[PDB]
Design a protein around this ligand. Structure first.
Ligand SMILES: O=C(NCCc1ccccc1)c1nc([C@@H]2CCCN2C(=O)COc2ccccc2Cl)[nH]c(=O)c1O
Ligand SMILES: [Mn+2]
Ligand SMILES: [Mn+2]
Length: 179
């Protein structure tokens, strides 16, 4: 069965992102052809992670998401050993060499406060938390939004464009009521 959401994801995100998203889903035992809403969500989260790491200086961010589980933890161990930072309980998404902290990126369809709470309660104190929403809201640990305003604004704009493209295809309602 070929869903509209699967075909939309493929023409909406660039192929490297789609490829990385497909391998992650299969690595954790889910099918992009069936779990099509989560397919879209993982592509979205991946692109946000990459845009975020592009927002700093040259060697500011180490990218943890988008790797297979073993090498992602391998990079975490190396980061932890040369900087002396506690090994996080769960895999984070980036590491900030400038502020010397792991970052967990969040992309939510619901209101921001709730997701931050669930993410904070679930995650480990040292890891910095940065949530984006499809409505333009954001929340970061200690109100410290790591990047400058233009880089985060660009992430916000893209997320709202994605929402519009789905709404134009009558796929937004199913996506919001799927998280
Ligand atoms: O890295 C994340 N998950 C690592 C894998 C994992 C798997 C199970 C438990 C804990 C961790 C992560 N997960 C999430 C959300 C909330 C926590 C679970 N979850 C998922 O999406 C789980 O499913 C997947 C995750 C990744 C690929 C494919 C699937 Cl199917 N939100 C992120 O912002 C984020 O970075
Ligand atoms: Mn992650
Ligand atoms: Mn994340």
């Amino acid at each position: 069965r070929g869903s509209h959401m699967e075909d939309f994801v493929r023409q909406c995100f660039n192929p490297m992102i789609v490829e990385l998203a497909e391998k992650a889903m299969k690595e954790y035992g889910e099918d992009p052809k069936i779990e099509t809403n989560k397919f879209a969500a993982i592509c979205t989260h991946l692109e946000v992670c990459f845009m975020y790491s592009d927002g700093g200086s040259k060697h500011r961010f180490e990218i943890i998401e988008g790797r297979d589980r073993i090498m992602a933890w391998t990079v975490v161990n190396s980061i932890c050993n040369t900087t002396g930072v506690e090994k996080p309980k769960f895999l984070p998404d980036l590491y900030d060499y400038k502020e010397n902290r792991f970052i967990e990126i969040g992309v939510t369809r619901r209101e921001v406060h709730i997701y931050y709470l669930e993410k904070a309660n679930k995650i480990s104190e040292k890891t910095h938390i940065h949530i984006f929403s499809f409505t333009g809201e954001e929340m970061a640990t200690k109100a410290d939004y790591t990047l400058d305003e233009e880089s985060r604004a660009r992430i916000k704009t893209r997320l709202f464009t994605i929402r519009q493209e789905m709404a134009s295809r009558s796929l937004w309602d199913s996506f919001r009521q799927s998280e």
